[PDB]
Amino acid sequence: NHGTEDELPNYCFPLGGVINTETLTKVKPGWEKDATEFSDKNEIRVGNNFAMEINLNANLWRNFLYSNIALYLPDKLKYSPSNVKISDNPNTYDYMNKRVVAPGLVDCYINLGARWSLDYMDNVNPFNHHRNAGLRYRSMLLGN
Amino acid sequence: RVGNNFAMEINLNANLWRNFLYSNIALYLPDKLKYSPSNVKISDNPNTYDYMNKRVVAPGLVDCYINLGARWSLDYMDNVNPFNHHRNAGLRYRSMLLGNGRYVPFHIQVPQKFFAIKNLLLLPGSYTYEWNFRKDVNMVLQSSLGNDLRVDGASIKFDSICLYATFFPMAHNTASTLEAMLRNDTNDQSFNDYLSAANM
Amino acid sequence: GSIPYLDGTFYLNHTFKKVAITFDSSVSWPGNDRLLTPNEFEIKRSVDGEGYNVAQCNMTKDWFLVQMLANYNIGYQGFYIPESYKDRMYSFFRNFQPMSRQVVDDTKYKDYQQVGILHQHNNSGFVGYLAPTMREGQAYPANFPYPLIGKTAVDSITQKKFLCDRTLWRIPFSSNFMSMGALTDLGQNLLYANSAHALDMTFEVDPMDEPTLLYVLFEVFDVVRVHRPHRGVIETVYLRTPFSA
Amino acid sequence: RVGNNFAMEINLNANLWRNFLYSNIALYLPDKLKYSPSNVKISDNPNTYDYMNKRVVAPGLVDCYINLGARWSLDYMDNVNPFNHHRNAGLRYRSMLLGNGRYVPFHIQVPQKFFAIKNLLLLPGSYTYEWNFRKDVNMVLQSSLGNDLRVDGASIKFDSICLYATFFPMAHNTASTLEAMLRNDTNDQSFNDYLSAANMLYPIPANATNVPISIPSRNWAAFRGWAFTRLKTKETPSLGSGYDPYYTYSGSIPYLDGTFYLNHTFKKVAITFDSSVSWPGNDRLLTPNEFEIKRSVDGEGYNVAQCNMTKDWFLVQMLANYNIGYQGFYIPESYKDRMYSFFRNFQPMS
Amino acid sequence: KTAVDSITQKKFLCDRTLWRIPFSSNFMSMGALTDLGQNLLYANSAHALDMTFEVDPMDEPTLLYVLFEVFDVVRVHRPHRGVIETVYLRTPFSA
Amino acid sequence: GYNVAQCNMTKDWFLVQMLANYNIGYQGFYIPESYKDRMYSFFRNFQPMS
Amino acid sequence: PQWSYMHISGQDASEYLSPGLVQFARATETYFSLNNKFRNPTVAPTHDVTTDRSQRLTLRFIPVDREDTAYSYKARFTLAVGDNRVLDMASTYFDIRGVLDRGPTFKPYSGTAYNALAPKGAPNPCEWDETHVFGQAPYSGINITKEGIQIGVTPKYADKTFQPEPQIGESQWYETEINHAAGRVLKKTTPMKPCYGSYAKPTNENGGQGILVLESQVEMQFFSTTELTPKVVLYSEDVDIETPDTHISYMPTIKEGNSRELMGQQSMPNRPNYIAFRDNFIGLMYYNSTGNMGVLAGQASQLNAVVDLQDRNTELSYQLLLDSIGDRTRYFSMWNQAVDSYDPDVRIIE
Amino acid sequence: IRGVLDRGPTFKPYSGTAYNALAPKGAPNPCEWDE
Amino acid sequence: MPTIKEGNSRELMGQQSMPNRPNYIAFRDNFIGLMYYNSTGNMGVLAGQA
Structure with a gap:
């Protein structure tokens, strides 16, 4: 985490x-109005x-950390969404997709x-990730 | 609607291009192109972080x-040391090896570089081995801005120093035979310094 | 910061113009009509000498050939990129960076105005004035920089230079500049065997607005021989030659 | 508040992804997918910058x-020359070597490439050495859009030309001994051209698919084999010509520079000696009378490597390039698999 | 869960290279002068050759570029000061 | 005191791993030749952090 | 004596060490290596390699003849190899100088040089007839009289040729009600163009751009609310407005001349187009052309040693040779050696 | 060698801020003053 | 910094904040500088103890 090059404001x-x-x-010119010359509503x-x-x-740094690290944090740090049905089976996509993690x-x-790996992530299998390029390539060999 | x-x-x-140019080039321009901030106290000592940090440079x-x-380096930057920069990746890595905080207990292994002994095969005996070590923070540390760390509050205490040595577990008959060969004058070891220069 | 003398972070090699080497007051080395400017080593030439420049920058043909030969033994049977395992971090060709640009020709562009940073506007209304602070001002046609392309490109001049960071400049004492053994042919020559000689070197450099140092490495044999005749005895004979201590 | x-x-x-796709792909789509702008004058000549710049493409x-x-290249872009692009880094670098402006005084060193003399050791003597140089801006320059620079205002003046030569400072007795050895006929120098080919071009009219060629009876002793590709005629100057008045393109020229990009448009080739002796014949190939390069859906059983390339073609390419194919298929050693080699460039997609 | 019925398309690119068919009896590189190039069949007679390529249609004129691979050689004789003589041989396809 | 290489790995373990993988450890520690330090080798994968 | 003893010269370690230590070291290298503890001398030859006589390393030759056609030129040299010399032709080259004009379609970048942060349909402050003003006054002054905006102190007024400067404005974000405001505005006689891409050359050393006709024609325009003191002075001027590297992406009307509708036009940067010499300077020298054939011949001796053919391809042979012996990803400026390439993620979209 | 280092107050191993980085750079905190 | 004036004020609501410049601090490559070389007054020793 070397922070962000945000010295200049962006608008x-x-x-x-x-x-x-x-x-x-x-x-x-004392001063008086004009017309037929210049319009009177400029x-x-x-x-x-x-x-x-x-x-x-x-923002770009935040998005990268949320997509590639926060969403992969161990499930014990996540919580179940409010007013949304979620699977009871933690092995499912629906559960993994709907469990909520706080960006903070x-x-x-x-x-x-x-330069530090999170203790929470050291024992999480790093190959199970959308940035596994071999697996992405093998998925793309079959198609989309 | x-x-x-x-x-x-x-x-x-x-915008992304602007930010990259300002952070990595404009802020490193020679100080003669910068100016001192309005309504802000700044150090009188150009070697300080406070001076380097508060001097203002125009993004334009x-x-x-x-x-x-x-593809052109700025004439203003050609003679500015390019290694003194936050994108020096070796220095960033060495900074990160110690940690992210100003307070660091450290534990390091320091190699012997003098050509006459750094590859010597030393035979049985007891030898005095003594070396002298620096304490000046401007020599023993390195910063990316190159500010004077003597005035800018860095310090260092060297608490302990041990000498480690590793020995091939050689068969004892072979070791004694080797030693005897290596004590004859025809078998003196010799070393050339790599740089091999008188430096002026 | 980094300390180039100790760490090898050299970055001022492009500030050299030439070096003249002379033994015994008046014997130019290499002499022998070897170089296109034969009494000195010219490193770079300005516009007036561009015919003898090379590789699309202001480096001279002669200097490029001496550097290529000193580093890689390349220069008599064509110039080519050296094998990557011979072209290391602090080698000449890995670090050689020729560059060129155009800029408005302030004598031939009839409409030239010297507009300084205080009066340049481009993105007025959308950026801060002279500082990385809040947007200010109003949208307006830019007045800077001059366009160097398109149908109204301004009259321009070309500038050329190079950088060559990390490496040292090298002039080997070898009769064709090539590496043919560490103990060079000239180092073994009768001329240097039997007499003593004085040496003058005169470097020309670009001016810099601070104190600098010329660092010359005079390349020699710096050797030690180590004798261990008895338990706990270690003896050493050192020899640096030439320049014996 | x-x-x-x-x-x-x-x-x-x-947004960043959108901008990258529009700048580097949408704007380079074939002109038939674009349209002319409303209320804006545009050139009538599609070879011009003004036309290429003002034709509008829909971002969608x-x-x-x-x-x-x-992972899929657009079918629309497969047959568009990929080297004619602002992300061609070699061309960007060569453009930047001259500078950033349109007006450039230049100073260059140009090498001799003809195989019979480019490595010759030339002995004492005085020789005439003369060469001829082009002036056509579409040959001597290259642009990333490939616009016709003859109409688009480029020009060039060649003011001076000098010949430089460098001599090893050889000991004079050794030089004279070497010279004498090298003047004997047993010690004649010899050189082979690297490409070592007689080069032919055969026309393929638009939309044609069948391309028959004939070589008349001749001797084939020492023949090494065939290499082939497909070129656009718009990209290929007439051979041997002093000046080609119909060359209206300044992009990469694959014939000369090796930027080949139409190899995937081949389906097959049948080779026959003496009207009816199929080569290789001998029941060697899974389709034994021709070389099938690719097969559509109906022939998918004989395809390989997860694309529509055939097993046979893959085996011939692997053997021709690396000697791989009879004791398993594997990735070749990287030093054998160079820039213009088969496996480095092979890109199956679905 | 509502993926539409789909079809699969497959292709390849193979830019930069030339397609190669060596004149060698197992297609392998076993010397520049190939085994088939030395065969009696091609030593003593002449032969005509037909090749028929099928390509995908393109909506502009294109060219088939065939390189017929041969030996293209020169031998250089310098018998006297300022004399240089050359014998060229391209074979087959001698000029 | 018995840790090494700026992490919590021990001197002894580092020496056994270096010797097992590359035969390095009795005549100094250095980075192995890259062709000996493959994808699943010790030093390529070793990542000390603080 | 001392060089031999310190191993600067003389025997290698295999000769000067005892033969048992040598055998032992060779046998045990894979267990515990001893070679780095014993110096071996390397010594250059001192005779029969080089000359100590006077002799240039590099010779330069000027043409003996040059001939020009509208499409080519020819340059003839007399290449002299002195006695007791040999010359490797790979050391030779043509050193060429000249002048290039890349022409008006060369654009070595994406985007615009000019007001790149402006929204692409934001107008410059301007005026049109239907006279209406659309503008901005960012400068806060002490007072306005018929003399224009006061800027400080006896009262001092804007120098109309450059003040108020469009780059300058209020310093804090919060609303402040400016009682006395100034800015610059384009007269109706200057064509309306979007801000993005707009440039007008400066006409004074203080950055102003007003057209000189030589005195300034800047005219002050005074304004107040619709209900008496002016609240705004605008400095109106004509400038030589250009769009050197952008074009219009939306042109609301066919109609000519300034209009309210023209405030809706949008600006897009021009397409990049790098222009350069080619990789390895392909195309500069003629090969494989019977009418433009190169010459190397003895000066006495009339007979050309170069024989070329239209079905040989010298340029492509060099491309392939270079890839076979070196790493074409590396660049060398001297021969414009920078291979054409493409972005793999442009050619195949992932 | 073991010891203790203090890099001092000018050590800053990152660009940007740790604190409210998404705030506009001239937005005040909610505050109060006298006039 | 809108004012020289001290203490809170409406004008101070206009101040703008910029991050400090980065400045990495570390030991040097190969721990250059820790041990003295080439210094006659601080010379290293290796000698038989006797």
């Missing part, structure tokens, strides 16, 4: 560049544009700055 | 469009 | 969900 912006415009009227944004902010690199168990900040 | 949905727009790939100095379409 | 904060939602990984043709869970 999304409105489709037109700007959205919270003021309606304004052209004036001339749309001008005063200040910076409307923006929202997302940490891209932290392997979050962005897990053993930050360390 | 009448019409299309409300949406905002972000260039993902341009190495932006998305820097020498676009080229 | 009462409640949760105002938030908008974006699938990052799906290669979207996130394209053959999901499969």
Whole structure:
């Protein structure tokens, strides 16, 4: 976990560049109105544009940790979903798929700055994983 | 809702490229291109972490469009030591071998490198073997920023030192025969230093 | 940080321009009209000398041939990539990195304006000004950089350079620069057997705005012979030659 | 604020995957799947950059969900030259060696490739050495889109040409002794061309499938065998020509550079000497009169290796390339399985 | 659970290489000058050859490229200062 | 004190594994030649961590 | 004496050690190796290999003749091999300089150089007739008079040729009600283009882009609410607006000239297109062409030692030879030796 | 050799922050001030 | 940092935070620097005890 290269803020912006415009009227020199020349309803944004902010690199790291580690944590750390029927047989796909794991168990900040396998995962078979490339290839040889 | 949905727009790939250039190149630009922050106290000593961390660099100095379409190192970076960087993978690994915290009890095995003895076959006898070890944190440690660790609070205590040696469990008649051959002057061992240079 | 002298993280080899080697005040080495510039080793040449450059950078033909021969014995029967097991981490060709770029020609591009970082705008409205801080400003056509492609590409100039990190530059004392035994042919020559000689070397380097050091390794035999004549006795004879201590 | 904060939602990984598929696959789809833009002028000449750049492709043709869970090349792209792409790293590097701008003064060293002289040890004498050099931008340059650079404004001036030669500083007595040995006829040098082939090209008109060829009666002593592939005529300059006025393409040229990519379009080949002696004959092959390369569904029993390649073809390719096939099939030693070898390039898919 | 009825398609790519049919009695490499190349059958007579390829149809003109593999050799004689003479032999398919 | 290689493996075990796999341990510890250190070999798979 | 004793010269260890130690060491190498404890000398020959006479390593030859056609040139040299020399032709090459123009379709990157973070359909601030203004004023000043926006201090006003600068804006995220705002705007006489991909050359050393006609034509435009002091000054200017590396992906109207509808146009970057010389400089020299045949001949002696054929393929033979003896994944700039390749995950979608 | 090392307060073996990394970088915590 | 001023204020709501630069600290490759070489005042010893 060498953390994330998030020094620069990352923003999304409105489709037109700007959205919270003021309606304004052209004036001339003491000051008086204009018309037949310039329109009397111009749309001008005063200040910076409307923006929202997302940490891209932290999100990508979070998603990688959740998909490849949190979801594979031993079942004793998971819990059964609320208001959802789940199989009674832990050997089933339905059980493995519906058991819920909290993302904060392997979050962005897990053993930050360390090279460290989780004690919870040391004794879990690492080959039983969607990133087993030999098994993915053998699955793909048959088709999709 | 009448019409299309409300949406905002972000260039993902341009942002990821921008972040990579800022983190790994802009922040490592020579200090003469940086400036000191406004309304923030900063160290007066450029060798410190606080100075290196708080000096500000403009992202437009190495932006998305820097020498676009080229394979080109920045002239500003050619003479900056490239190994002093958080993407030095050997140094990252060595840092991670100790752990992720500032406080580390350590336990290491240190090899003998002097060419006249590092491959010597030493015959029966009792020998004095003594060596001298450094304590200066700027020599015994390495940082990726290269800050002066003497002023920046690192320290180290060497608590114990043992000498280990491993012996092939040689048949005793063979060992004594070998020893006798190796004590004759025609069978003196010899070694050349690898670098083989006088260094100025 | 890293300490190149001890660890081999060399990264300033491209700052060398040339070296002239002279024995006894006036005997140029190698002399013998061997090199295209025969009195010195020219490492790189600027624009004015580009005819003698090679490999699409500003390194000279002569220097490339001496480096290839010193490292791999390649240069008299064609240039090719060395076998990977001969081209190690700190070897010449593994580290050789020629590069080129164009840039606006500030004398021929009639419309040239020297616009500095304080006044460049590109992504105004969407990035912070001079800092990695909050977006600010307004959307506007960019004023920078100059386009070097398309139908309105600006007049441009080309720059060429190289990096060659990790390795040391090498000039072997061997009559064809090739490795033909550790104890070289010139090292055994009568000329160096019987007399003494003084040596001058003059290096030209690119200027750097801090103190630096020329590190010269004078390559010799650095040898020890070890005698163990009796239980718990170890004796050693050292010989470094030349440059005996 | 009462409640949760105002938030908008974006699938990052799906977007990154979408962008990769659009940039590297959708935009390279055959032009018959594209359409011309509305309210925008476009060139009438499909060989131009302007046409290639402005033709529109729908992203849903290669979207996130394209053959999901499969390892599968698109049938639309199998017969499109894969080397003509911005992810050709050799071509990107060669472009970057010159710089990032359209205007480049250049300085290059060009090697001699003709087998009879490229390794010759030339003895004392004075010799005329003359060579001829091309100027056609479609031959001397290469582009990743393969647009016609004759119409698209590239040009080149060759200002100076010098010949360089390097000499081992040989001891003079040794050099004269060597020269004298090498002037005797028993010590003549000799060289074989590496490819060692007479090269022919036969036309395959569009949509044709049957390609018969004939070699007239001649002597075959010392014949080593046959090698073959398929080329686009649009990608193959006329042989031997000073200048080909109908060559309107600047991509990779497989005939010259080895970027072959149409080998999977072969079904079979039948070889016959003297009108009716099938070769190899001798009941050697599972279909004994021809070499069947691939079989469709109806012949799947004789297919192998989880694709539609036949057992027989796989065995001939393995034996021809590596001498493997009579004492089991296995992966060849990597040093025998080079860049242009059969097994390194073999890619079965379903 | 509601997967649609499906069919399977299989194919291969094999870029970069040439397809190879060696003139050798077991297809193996046992010397450059092959066993069949030395056979009496091909030593003393002449023979015509037909080859018939079947290919998948493509909606543009293409070319079959056949390399007929032979010995393509030159021998170089330098008998006097500034004299260089050459004998070429390509066989079979001599020019 | 009897651990090695910056993890909790013992000196003795490391020496037996190195000798069993590569014949390394009486004339110094070093990385084995890669062609001797295969997919299921000791040193290729050894991962000390702290 | 001392070199022999220190093993700089003289016998190897197998000769100078006692014969029993030698036998014992050879027999036991696989149990406990002793070879690294005894130095062996390596000594270069000192006679009959090289010369100590004056002699160049490399010779350069200038053409004795050059001939040009519109499609080729020919360069003739007199290659001299002096007495007591031999020359390996693999050491020879043509050193060529010249000027290349890759032309206007060369684009060695994906994306745009210009305002890449703008949403692809966001307009620049602009003006059109139906006169209407769509714009932004991000600069906060002390006051506005008919002199324009005040920027500090006797009052000091924006230098209209570059101030307010579009890169500069308020420093904090929270709403602040700016009483006196300024920004720049494009006049209706500048064509409307999306922000993304927009560039206009600077016309002053302070980054402004106003067209000079030489004095500035920047005109101030004053604005207030619809209910008296101006709240906004806009600095309107024409700039030489270009889209050097993008094109329009949505063009709302056939109609010409600025309009409200044109604010809806969207910009897409142009396709990348690397242009270069070819791998191993294929195509620069003619081979296998009877009309453009190379020459190597004794100068006295008239008869060309090069004989080539149209059905030989010299370029492809070199490609195959290089793959057979070296690792084509490695690059060498000197011969433009950088093999064409493709992204395996582009050719076969996984 | 065994001993104790203190890498000191400038050791930081990662990029980014451990703490509220997904917050916008100028978003305040909920807070109170006087005017 | 919007103000020189000290203590909480509406303006302080505008401040922005950036992560600190990474800085790995370790022993050196091959533990370079721990043992003295090539130093006449700190010279190593190997000698018969007698």
